[PDB]
Amino acid sequence: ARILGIDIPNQKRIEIALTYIFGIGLSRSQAILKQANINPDKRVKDLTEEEFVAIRNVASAYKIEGDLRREIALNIKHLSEIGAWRGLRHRKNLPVRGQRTRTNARTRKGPRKTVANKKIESK
Amino acid sequence: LTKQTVHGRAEKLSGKFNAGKAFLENKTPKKAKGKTEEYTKHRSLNEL
């Protein structure tokens, strides 16, 4: 569309269109929506320039969607440049919080790389 | 062109360390174990 480099679907309502932006989710989209007073359920294609400037202004007032990626990136580098054990745990692509790593937590380990289970000839 | 800096952390957390240190120096040994008290019996025939 016209809001920064994001191309919000044209045939979709504005409150979901704001979610399509990286730095704006759903709850925060409603906050901008209520604050700007623009009524929801108004398809973005059937919207005028008067709303397109106010919404951009409040979005600019909030944290820029493009800066958040580098903000998370600096934070990981900030965590790794300290030498924290949590940083180390985030370092080797493993659960950072307290999640178990015995039989689960594959969403951070990608696909399974099947090895060879021990050979049991009986005892 | 740079708008100086708006980060640096510290300051915000600094107030938190001050709050924690003030608590630690405040610490009063108010050790206790309980709440409501009395009204604890099984009654009788008021004299048997």
Binding site: I82, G83 | F17, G20, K21, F23
Partner: protein, 86 residues
């Protein structure tokens, strides 16, 4: 996470040694068993020997490591390679 009213937490044994050790110029590693003490602004510049479980690993605190817990910058277990079962 940790509440506001409570604030931070040090055992106050580590705090007393740090105050004494900062005044003394010829500082040496401080042997602390308290992995539970959060790093306070005054800790900056000192070095500590946190008990990993077996030995005392030396950590040099900076103006950046401020805020987390003193045991968080040291490990406790070690795993580096498996072994083919079959």
């Amino acid at each position: 996470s940790r509440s506001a009213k409570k604030g931070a937490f040090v055992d106050a044994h580590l705090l007393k040694k740090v105050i004494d050790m900062n005044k003394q110029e010829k500082k040496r590693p401080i042997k602390t068993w308290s992995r539970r003490s959060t790093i306070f602004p005054e800790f900056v510049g000192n070095t500590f020997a946190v008990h990993n479980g077996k030995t005392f690993i030396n950590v040099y605190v900076t103006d950046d490591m401020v805020g987390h817990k003193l045991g968080e910058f040291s490990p406790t277990r070690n795993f580096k390679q498996h072994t083919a079962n079959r």
